[PDB]
Amino acid sequence: NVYKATRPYLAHCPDCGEGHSCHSPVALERIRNEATDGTLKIQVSLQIGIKTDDSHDWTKLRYMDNHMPADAERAGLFVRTSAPCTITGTMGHFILARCPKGETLTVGFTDSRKISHSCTHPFHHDPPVIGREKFHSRPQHGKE
Amino acid sequence: LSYRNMGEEPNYQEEWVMHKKEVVLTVPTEGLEVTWGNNEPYKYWPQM
Amino acid sequence: NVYKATRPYLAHCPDCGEGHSCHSPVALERIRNEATDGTLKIQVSLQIGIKTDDSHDWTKLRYMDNHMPADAERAGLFVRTSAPCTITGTMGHFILARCPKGETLTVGFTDSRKISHSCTHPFHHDPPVIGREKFHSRPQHGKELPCSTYVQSTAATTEEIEVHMPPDTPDRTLMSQQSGNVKITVNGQTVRYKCNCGGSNEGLTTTDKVINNCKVDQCHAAVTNHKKWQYNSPLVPRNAELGDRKGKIHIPFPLANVTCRVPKARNPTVTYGKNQVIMLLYPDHPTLLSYRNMGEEPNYQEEWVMHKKEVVLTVPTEGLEVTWGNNEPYKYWPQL
Amino acid sequence: ARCPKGETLTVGFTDSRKISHSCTHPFHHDPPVIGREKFHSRPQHGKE
Amino acid sequence: YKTVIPSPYVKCCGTAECKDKNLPDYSCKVFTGVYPFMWGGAYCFCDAE
Amino acid sequence: GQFGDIQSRTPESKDVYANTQLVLQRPAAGTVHVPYSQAPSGFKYWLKE
Amino acid sequence: YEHVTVIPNTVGVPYKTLVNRPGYSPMVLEMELLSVTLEPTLSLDYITCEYKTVIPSPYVKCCGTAECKDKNLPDYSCKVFTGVYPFMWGGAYCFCDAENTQLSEAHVEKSESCKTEFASAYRAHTASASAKLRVLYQGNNITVTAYANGDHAVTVKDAKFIVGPMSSAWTPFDNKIVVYKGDVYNMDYPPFGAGRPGQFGDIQSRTPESKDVYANTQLVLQRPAAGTVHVPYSQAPSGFKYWLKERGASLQHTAPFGCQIATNPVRAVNCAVGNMPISIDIPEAAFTRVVDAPSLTDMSCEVPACTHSSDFGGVAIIKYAASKKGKCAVHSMTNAVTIREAEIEVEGNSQLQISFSTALASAEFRVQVCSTQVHCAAECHPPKDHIVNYPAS
């Protein structure tokens, strides 16, 4: 459980909700979009799949709560651009998600005290044109 | 939509078609190759 | 009760969620958009307003769950393009919905086991604005314009669908690899089997059967029930021992021409001059401005006004007619 | 309320009898732009 | 217009033949070497026939 | 694709004329469907242009 | 018997040659180019990819001064900011109000993606030609694959084949080329250690696994925000990422003579340019003395139908009187008319139907059946189409 030694910290956010900037535990760092299929590699301030005692638990989340790290739920975690995104992988600071056409990326979660925190960053999302056709929905059967 | 001549001077031209469009392309003696999206390139040759 | 011979079924989907294709019980068939008002006629794999015991219940839903049909909730059903859609009618395979501008149509629901299944199809949605004003809320009293919508008459008339027999429902979950042999688990059902291997390689079994020295891929089974009817779906295979034998049933909600009440663009700030007219156009939505001369040479000019614009138009002796959106044409005459 | 880009404003609630009522009005919502750059997210430190 | 398309006739371990029908814009085609799949597995026994 | 791609005598007429350039395509791997290439409705296009 | 022939460098067109060994009956060989491959000799200059701006945790010195250490790293940038008062979760990180400093250090490295996502900068020198050729030898199609240098000999059905050497040295590639996955671009890329920021070559490395890298990205550190711990910087965006968007069409789409560009190794396939010599050493067992062949006499030529087009739009019936049953070669002795039939069967007093292609309206041509010639009179008519979809002689 590599999460025994490792830990979590806090950062800053440009949009915690309603255009107000604050110190968010779900603060956005780097949003990688090198994948041609459309998968986004999101780097966050908190840690997913690890508990406060440094132990592996996929249903648990580790975030910073006023000087001390606290536990949260994996189900509470959400990613959205203009519509919700499907999460296809979570480990530590990294989240994998497939998002529709959007201009701002939003990443959030829900804590133990039932309070939701979300960080919004301006990001022009528009999966490149893989091929010669600019389609929106992906086909089950087509050209390889 | 992309097109080229199959001779000495290819003269490559590219354009993103989005709406209903009518395109008139000149076919030389050497031939004209037209690629429409992910489809295989269509070959055209002059005749009588 | 035409629903005596009718029944539900299952189909395939090109997008069950996160771009992955599967066999969805909420599979999309045909998305009709003939109505000029903006109403969509969606055909789905499941049946709404009917229970498993063949009884009418508006709060209940009937979907296919691994060889057997199961009940679900009407409240769990949802339709969306880019934002959620308002459902304005549900009966059997058909759903009526008003959707905003979108490129992909999504139809889903929630089962008894609290698991949500949704089918996504690429569909370019963009209803043709009615009139010359892009309003959101419909008015109780306004300008009468011709349009089209799907009526709520259940009466068996006009439109019809082709329904065929569902011979034997294929099921690969009926076969199992018992070490080096194939076991066919009946589960109190009549199963029709066929294998490539020797010995018993055909028949209609009511009991559990075992095929010695065979592989699951070299076998095929399916339940029998040539007592129910099914709609001609391209997502379901055609009956093997059948050519083009099919039936037909009348369908509810037909398309009919009606009347729609739209709005009219607000009058612009008009100032007159020496043989010229000045208009200060303030459009709330894209409004069409057209003008012509009332003489020998009309010289028609058209432009879509979207932002704050000032237009100077020359008025000849014959007269100038200006049409601003859905408003009645304004006539102007100079002199002297 | 702080609202995103929209063309119609909707305000609703739920009563004692578990029935939801909502009123929709056509309203062009779109926060104006300040400065000379059209950004989305607000910066913590920048030009005053 | 309405493009009326019925259920496709999938012939397992055999060949199907097109019948010339007197219908507006009637189109017919037979595709060889098809291996289709359904909910419970393959609809046909043969691999390429 | 043009105005008159489908021609009929009256809205209730029996016989119809059709020129839509309809061609069937080979179905996808392990898929039961009827893929086709056809020019879109000339009447629907005219109603816009 | 060695047979030397020259055919144009055109893939998909069948060419017929007459093999006439003195004292032996003539032989007709049909040759068709299936593929021409022109592989250039490459020399890798460098490789370009996305860069990684490695920025560690800033050294915030409370109640003191921090000093920059000159490090030997690509695009190494260092700066110390005086009078900083940063804030954390539980309050201020420092005790002093204005006596605090912050050391902001940075450097440019090759991204983890460079092993997968990269563009290679090659220097093309000379090219070696090699060809796939189809031969209708003894009524059977044979496949011959050999280098077009005029030295590499391949023996198929006891016949030695020597392709080459290429006549033209023209190549769709220039002295400097750029390769990305399956696309080749004729680019005049910047030399090694001379790349500019924001452009193709802002980050230059020898191989995708190389240790030392060149970096020119114009990286400058900025002063952090009031009560904020962060490393703000001004840097020109990735030149490789920008090029991937603004590169245009590759050689596969822009090259003349209908060139098809392939990768790994990079070479040009099917390129109609120049000619190509082909030597065929046909064994003596494939020949058959003439005296052992059949003759022909009194032969008439009647043309019931002719349409001058790119394809065989002419039909000709030739009457003959043969000595014995055997195979006889059919060939047009006129360079304007071409016959579809290479060889037919004769018996005695009979006739033969042949398909022919011509451009002339009035066509007077001689057809050599076996070893005897016959004059054909034809008045061909124009075709319905002015433009055709296939090339002709």
Coordinates of C-alpha atoms in Angstrom, one line a residue, chain C residues 9 39 57 69 92 96 108 111 121 137 139 146 167 169 183 187 201 214 232 266 276 282 321 326:
Chain C
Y9 CA -37.8 -8.0 -26.5
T39 CA -41.9 16.9 -31.1
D57 CA -50.1 0.5 -15.2
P69 CA -39.0 -9.8 -18.9
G92 CA -45.2 0.6 -25.4
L96 CA -42.7 11.6 -27.2
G108 CA -32.3 5.6 -20.6
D111 CA -34.2 -1.2 -13.2
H121 CA -27.4 7.3 -31.1
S137 CA -42.2 30.0 -23.4
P139 CA -48.0 32.2 -25.3
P146 CA -49.4 26.6 -39.6
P167 CA -39.6 -18.2 -33.2
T169 CA -35.1 -16.6 -28.6
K183 CA -24.2 -28.9 -20.5
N187 CA -34.4 -24.1 -16.1
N201 CA -27.0 -33.2 -32.3
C214 CA -17.8 -31.0 -27.6
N232 CA -39.8 -6.3 -37.3
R266 CA -40.7 44.8 -31.8
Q276 CA -34.5 58.1 -47.3
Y282 CA -33.0 45.9 -31.8
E321 CA -42.1 48.2 -48.8
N326 CA -43.2 38.3 -38.8

